[PDB]
Amino acid sequence: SGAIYVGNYRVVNRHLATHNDWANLVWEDSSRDLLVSSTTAQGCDTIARCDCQTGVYYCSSRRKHYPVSFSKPSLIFVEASEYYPARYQSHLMLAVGHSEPGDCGGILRCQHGVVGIVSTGGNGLVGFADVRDLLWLDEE
Ligand SMILES: CO[C@@H](C(=O)N1CCC[C@H](C(N)=O)C1)c1ccccc1C
Ligand SMILES: [Zn+2]
C-alpha cells in the first residue's frame, strides 16, 4: 500500500483505490495502473520533473529503502493477475530489486522529488508507474 500526497491530490495504484477515492475521483487510467483522488488537507510530496534513471524506492516487505537504476517509461507486458488480465501497461519503468504483492504504492524518488510508485514486480524485478509527465499534479 501507499500513496503520493501532492497539493490537494492523492495518487494511488488504481487497483488499490478505495471507495472514498472513487467517490472523489480526479483522473484514472487502467493502462497505467494509476488513480488520483482529491484531498481536504494539502500534502508535502513534490513531483520530480526530470529524466533521472537512478533513484531510491521504499520496499514495505523489507522495511527498507533501496537505491536502484531503472529503465525509461515504456509499454511492457504484464502477466494476468487477480487485478488485471494479461495486457500491456504503459509508462512503466523496471529495475532489479525485491518486490512482493503488498509492496505496490511504495515511492520511487530521485534528487528532484517523487518519480512514481511501485506497480509490478516478481523474481527480483520491481516496476514503477511513472508520474513525471502528469504536469497538472503541480497546480489547481
Ligand atoms: C503478481 O503480482 C505482481 C504484479 O506484477 N502485479 C500484481 C498487482 C497488479 C500489477 C499490475 N500493475 O498490473 C501486476 C507483483 C506486484 C508488485 C510487486 C511484486 C509482484 C510479484
Ligand atoms: Zn530526477
Under DSSP, the state recorded for 73 is S
Strand partners, 44: 6
Q: Are 76 and 26 in a shared domain?
A: no
Strand partners, 58: 65
How would you class 124 by CB atoms within 10 Å of its CB: exposed for 0-12, middle for 13-18, buried for 19 or more?
exposed
Residues within the annotated binding site for Zn(2+)? 50, 52, 110, 112
Q: Are 39 and 62 in a shared domain?
A: no
| Contact of 113 with 48, CB cutoff 8 Å | yes
Measured from the CB, is residue 5 less than 6 Å from ligand 1?
no
Q: Compute the distance between CA of residue 60 and CA of residue 78 in angstroms, rounded to an integer.
A: 21
Measured from the CB, is residue 120 less than 6 Å from ligand 1?
yes
What is the β-pairing status of strands 87-96 and 54-59?
unpaired
Query: Could you list the residue range(s) of the whole structural domain that residue 126 is in?
Result: 45-140
Provide the 3-class DSSP secondary structure of residue 135: helix
Q: Are 91 and 23 in a shared domain?
A: no
C-alpha cell at position 8: 490537494
Going from the Cα of 40 to the center of ligand 2, the distance in angstroms, rounded, reads 28
Site to substitute for ligand 1 among 28, 104, 125, 130, most atoms within 8 A of C-beta: 104
| Contact of 135 with 97, CB cutoff 8 Å | no
